[PDB]
RNA sequence: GUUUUUUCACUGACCCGGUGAGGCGGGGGGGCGAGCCGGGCUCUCGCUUCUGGCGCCAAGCGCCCGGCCGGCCGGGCGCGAC
């Protein structure tokens, strides 16, 4: 072995993984943020019932620590639906509006019937 | 010449013969610079070749 | 015992011997940062009146202060 | 009660210079094998302007002895240099100008400037604009050199530093008088916070020595002792004679 | 036979003409903070002029020797913590249905039994880290008339011990077989270290300068004359 | 002898400067002039200066080592780079 650099520098050393005696806590925190918890009701201002005839989507009220990826997934377990794209914004009042843009396979007032608003 | 002059970030959509000239140095440096110095590279290679064989030519009378 | 032979002889710190010692390992102890753990006591003998029994858990910090 | 302004210097802050534009550090080469045996071959890429500094600089760039890397040095440029030209810097470099070599290796009433004060600091001695060191005499036992500065002060200099060749280049530029307070405030703007010198007489009492008074004089011998405390040593610091200049 | 396209390009290594070959800088590395002190405090053992009480460890048993006394402790070795199990079962056997000779392991053991003079031959350690655990026995065995021998290595002399280092090993009882042996390494080693001991007291260590500070005054004295 | 002291210089704490801590000190062998008659000593050198190219990841030479069928289809180590 011989010093090409006049520099030394800490060799690789061999470091293992976690091989624990014990998991730290118990059992895994379960997903608090459900499905059910993630939409917590839809809007049936006038505003928001055009919205359902007019351009046909649904608007819902979500939890404001939902991305758009996890209220599709939400919108298409809990109403047996598919989303075409979805549009979060939080309101001056401090919870988040969910403009869900149905895909234009589904009537939104006849699901909007379905979830029971009128 | 030869290469489009726009905002740098863009380069990456543009085909590489819009980036470049078809040439030795091209797209990097100019027509002018690069002959003059296939000349420079040249005459100073051959230079070396003119010492080279008056070195020892200059040794051998000793 | 040895350490009645060690205590005697780190009494005559202006012996050779001793001043010999007292300074290359102040030289050492410079080249060292302000403060690290010495691997064992530097006097095995000073540490046995102190309380060092030399068993696991038991650690020594050689640390300098400005004078 | 208050601080001096002087003392306020040093703290920093609002002294501090102004480095921002300021082109790199201006040094020399760094002393290697092929400074201290024989010599290596370097081009001036572009001479320069440096903000603060009255002398332009030198990218030269030399060729790396071993990684296939290539260097760039930023040398005070002496008189003459031009771009393209080849520089030279070793023990065994021919003695023509804008070329440093040790000052061993040169004869007495040669003119240098960036002169190395010790072997290795890479280049501190007369190196501001149109300033030049003559190599005075040699001292081969003991290995020394005498070269006078530009203050006109021979120094007995160790002759295993370097220096390159020539006068610093923007030489003569004092001649020019400032005309106006805009060509004054513009140079110290490149430089540090120093311009507007209010004196101190003009200052109240408690912010220099030389303040107050109903007449606007000093009072006190402006001469001070080299011993005064800061806020205090202000004026002619260690005046060893003073007034107008009379002989040489 | 030969391809003519195969030509012979040598490099010129030359100042400023090829590149520098990839060549040994083992000596010119920038170290490690602990690299760099263990080696230059070996350097003040030999710059610094060590007193006789510290500089007498150098002085150490040879090869053709050592080798002689490392198989003659092999033979005395006390036990390990396996074999101990084995005769402490055999106690129990007898109980439900004397001690050989050994050497003596550490300064506190031997000390006591050499002015107490059981000690026939002691086995110095040159290399112990806190010296002033053992600076005094060279002396002390002087006095009481008990032959000391000094060994390289206090971990080989630590491995007749079934232990990591060992500071002094002093051997007490031989077998009648051994006893021939142990003398015949007292009749080497009290001649090479007790008998000329007042030699020892005024042999100071280092005081050498640099090969190239000696390189120097080496070209000076030439010079002159 | 012991001690004090003065000047010369020593390095090894301590300080400084540079570096990516890249060739330090001694010795040896190849150039160069000087000196008795092929041999030898006290020395000197170590390759690049007409140009605003180019160069790194080795050629060369030795040396060992694994099949099909002394012959072809691939690896290592030493100098070159004391």
């Given at each position: 072995?011989i010093?090409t650099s006049?520099?030394?520098?800490?060799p690789?050393?061999?470091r293992?993984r976690?091989?624990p005696?014990?998991?730290?806590?118990?059992?895994?925190?379960?997903?608090?943020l459900d499905?059910?918890?993630?939409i917590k009701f839809?809007?049936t201002?006038?505003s928001?019932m055009k919205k359902?005839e007019d351009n046909?989507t649904?608007?819902?009220?979500v939890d404001?620590?939902a991305?758009?990826?996890?209220?599709?997934?939400?919108?298409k377990?809990l109403?047996?639906?598919?989303?075409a794209?979805?549009?979060?914004?939080?309101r001056?009042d401090?919870?988040?509006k969910?403009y869900?843009?149905?895909?234009?396979?589904y009537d939104?007032?006849d699901?909007?019937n379905k979830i029971?608003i009128i | 010449?030869?290469?489009?002059?726009?905002?740098?970030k863009?380069?990456?959509?543009?085909?590489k013969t819009k980036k470049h000239?078809?040439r030795?140095?091209g797209?990097?440096?100019?027509?002018?610079?690069v002959?003059?110095?296939?000349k420079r590279?040249?005459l100073?290679?051959?230079?070396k070749?003119?010492?080279?064989?008056?070195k020892?030519?200059a040794?051998?009378?000793? | 015992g040895?350490?009645?032979?060690?205590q005697?002889?780190?009494?005559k710190?202006?012996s050779?011997?001793m001043?010999?010692?007292l300074?290359?390992?102040?030289?050492?102890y410079?080249?060292?940062?302000a403060?690290?753990?010495?691997?064992?006591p530097t006097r095995?003998?000073?540490?046995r009146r102190?309380?060092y029994?030399?068993?696991?858990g038991y650690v020594?910090?050689?640390?300098?202060?400005?004078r | 009660?208050r601080?001096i302004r002087?003392?306020?210097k040093?703290?920093?802050?609002?002294?501090?210079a102004h480095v921002?534009?300021?082109?790199?550090?201006?040094?020399?080469?760094?002393?290697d094998?092929?400074?201290?045996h024989?010599?290596?071959?370097?081009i001036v890429?572009?001479?320069?302007?440096?903000?603060?500094?009255g002398?332009?600089?030198a990218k030269?760039?030399?060729?790396?002895?071993?990684?296939?890397?290539?260097?760039?040095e930023?040398?005070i440029?002496?008189?003459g240099?031009?771009?393209?030209?080849f520089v030279?810097?070793?023990?065994?470099?021919q003695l023509?100008?804008?070329?440093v070599?040790?000052?061993?290796?040169?004869?007495?009433?040669?003119?240098?400037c960036?002169?190395?004060?010790?072997?290795?600091?890479?280049?501190?001695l007369?190196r501001?604009?149109?300033?030049?060191?003559?190599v005075?005499?040699?001292?081969?036992?003991?290995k020394?050199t005498r070269?006078?500065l530009p203050?006109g002060?021979?120094?007995?200099?160790?002759?295993?530093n370097?220096?390159?060749?020539?006068?610093?280049?923007g030489?003569?530029?004092?001649?020019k008088?400032i005309?106006?307070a805009?060509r004054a405030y513009h140079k110290?703007?490149?430089?540090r916070?120093c311009?507007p010198?209010?004196?101190?007489?003009?200052?109240?009492?408690?912010?220099?020595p030389?303040?107050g008074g109903?007449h606007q004089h000093i009072?006190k011998?402006s001469?001070?002792?080299?011993?005064?405390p800061?806020?205090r040593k202000?004026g002619?610091?260690a005046?060893?004679?003073?007034?107008?200049?009379?002989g040489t | 036979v030969?391809?003519?396209?195969f030509?012979?390009?040598p490099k010129?290594?030359g100042?400023?003409?090829?590149?520098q070959?990839?060549?040994?800088?083992?000596?010119?590395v920038?170290?490690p903070?602990?690299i760099?002190?263990q080696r230059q405090?070996?350097?003040?053992?030999?710059?610094?002029?060590?007193?006789?009480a510290i500089?007498?460890?150098?002085?150490?048993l040879d090869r053709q020797?050592?080798?002689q006394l490392?198989?003659?402790?092999?033979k005395?070795?006390p036990?390990?913590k396996?074999?101990?199990?084995q005769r402490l079962?055999?106690?129990?056997?007898?109980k439900?249905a004397?001690?050989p000779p050994?050497?003596?392991?550490?300064?506190?053991?031997?000390?006591?039994?050499?002015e107490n003079?059981?000690?026939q031959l002691?086995?110095?350690?040159?290399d112990?880290?806190?010296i002033?655990?053992?600076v005094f026995?060279?002396?002390?065995?002087?006095?009481?008339?008990?032959?000391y021998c000094i060994?390289?290595?206090?971990?080989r002399?630590?491995?007749?011990?079934?232990?990591?280092?060992?500071?002094?090993?002093?051997?007490?009882?031989v077998?009648?077989?051994?006893?021939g042996?142990?003398?015949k390494?007292?009749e080497?080693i009290?001649?090479?270290?007790?008998?000329?001991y007042?030699?020892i007291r005024?042999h100071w260590?280092?005081?050498?300068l640099?090969?190239?500070?000696?390189?120097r005054?080496?070209?000076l004295?030439?010079?002159?004359?």
């Amino acid at each position: 072995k011989i010093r090409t650099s006049p520099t030394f520098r800490r060799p690789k050393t061999l470091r293992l993984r976690r091989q624990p005696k014990y998991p730290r806590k118990s059992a895994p925190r379960r997903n608090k943020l459900d499905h059910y918890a993630i939409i917590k009701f839809p809007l049936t201002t006038e505003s928001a019932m055009k919205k359902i005839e007019d351009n046909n989507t649904l608007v819902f009220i979500v939890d404001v620590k939902a991305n758009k990826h996890q209220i599709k997934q939400a919108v298409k377990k809990l109403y047996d639906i598919d989303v075409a794209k979805v549009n979060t914004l939080i309101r001056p009042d401090g919870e988040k509006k969910a403009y869900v843009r149905l895909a234009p396979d589904y009537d939104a007032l006849d699901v909007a019937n379905k979830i029971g608003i009128i | 010449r030869g290469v489009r002059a726009v905002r740098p970030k863009v380069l990456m959509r543009l085909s590489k013969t819009k980036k470049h000239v078809s040439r030795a140095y091209g797209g990097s440096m100019c027509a002018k610079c690069v002959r003059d110095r296939i000349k420079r590279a040249f005459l100073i290679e051959e230079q070396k070749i003119v010492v080279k064989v008056l070195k020892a030519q200059a040794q051998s009378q000793k | 015992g040895a350490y009645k032979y060690i205590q005697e002889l780190w009494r005559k710190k202006q012996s050779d011997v001793m001043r010999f010692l007292l300074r290359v390992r102040c030289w050492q102890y410079r080249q060292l940062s302000a403060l690290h753990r010495a691997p064992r006591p530097t006097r095995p003998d000073k540490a046995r009146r102190l309380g060092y029994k030399a068993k696991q858990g038991y650690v020594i910090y050689r640390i300098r202060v400005r004078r | 009660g208050r601080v001096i302004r002087g003392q306020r210097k040093g703290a920093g802050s609002v002294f501090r210079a102004h480095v921002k534009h300021r082109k790199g550090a201006a040094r020399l080469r760094a002393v290697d094998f092929a400074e201290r045996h024989g010599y290596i071959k370097g081009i001036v890429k572009d001479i320069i302007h440096d903000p603060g500094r009255g002398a332009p600089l030198a990218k030269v760039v030399f060729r790396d002895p071993y990684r296939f890397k290539k260097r760039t040095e930023l040398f005070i440029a002496a008189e003459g240099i031009h771009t393209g030209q080849f520089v030279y810097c070793g023990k065994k470099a021919q003695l023509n100008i804008g070329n440093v070599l040790p000052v061993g290796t040169m004869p007495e009433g040669t003119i240098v400037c960036c002169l190395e004060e010790k072997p290795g600091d890479r280049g501190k001695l007369a190196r501001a604009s149109g300033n030049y060191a003559t190599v005075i005499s040699h001292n081969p036992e003991t290995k020394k050199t005498r070269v006078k500065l530009p203050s006109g002060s021979k120094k007995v200099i160790s002759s295993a530093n370097r220096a390159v060749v020539g006068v610093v280049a923007g030489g003569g530029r004092i001649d020019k008088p400032i005309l106006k307070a805009g060509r004054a405030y513009h140079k110290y703007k490149a430089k540090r916070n120093c311009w507007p010198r209010v004196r101190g007489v003009a200052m109240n009492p408690v912010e220099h020595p030389f303040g107050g008074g109903n007449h606007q004089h000093i009072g006190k011998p402006s001469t001070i002792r080299r011993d005064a405390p800061a806020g205090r040593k202000v004026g002619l610091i260690a005046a060893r004679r003073t007034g107008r200049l009379r002989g040489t | 036979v030969v391809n003519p396209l195969f030509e012979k390009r040598p490099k010129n290594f030359g100042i400023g003409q090829d590149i520098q070959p990839k060549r040994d800088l083992t000596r010119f590395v920038k170290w490690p903070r602990y690299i760099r002190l263990q080696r230059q405090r070996a350097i003040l053992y030999k710059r610094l002029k060590v007193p006789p009480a510290i500089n007498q460890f150098t002085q150490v048993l040879d090869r053709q020797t050592a080798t002689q006394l490392l198989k003659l402790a092999h033979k005395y070795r006390p036990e390990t913590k396996q074999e101990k199990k084995q005769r402490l079962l055999a106690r129990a056997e007898k109980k439900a249905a004397k001690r050989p000779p050994v050497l003596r392991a550490g300064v506190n053991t031997v000390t006591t039994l050499v002015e107490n003079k059981k000690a026939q031959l002691v086995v110095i350690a040159h290399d112990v880290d806190p010296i002033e655990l053992v600076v005094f026995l060279p002396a002390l065995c002087r006095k009481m008339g008990v032959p000391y021998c000094i060994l390289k290595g206090k971990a080989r002399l630590c491995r007749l011990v079934h232990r990591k280092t060992c500071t002094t090993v002093a051997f007490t009882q031989v077998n009648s077989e051994d006893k021939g042996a142990l003398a015949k390494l007292v009749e080497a080693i009290r001649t090479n270290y007790n008998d000329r001991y007042d030699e020892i007291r005024r042999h100071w260590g280092g005081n050498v300068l640099g090969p190239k500070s000696v390189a120097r005054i080496a070209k000076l004295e030439k010079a002159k004359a």
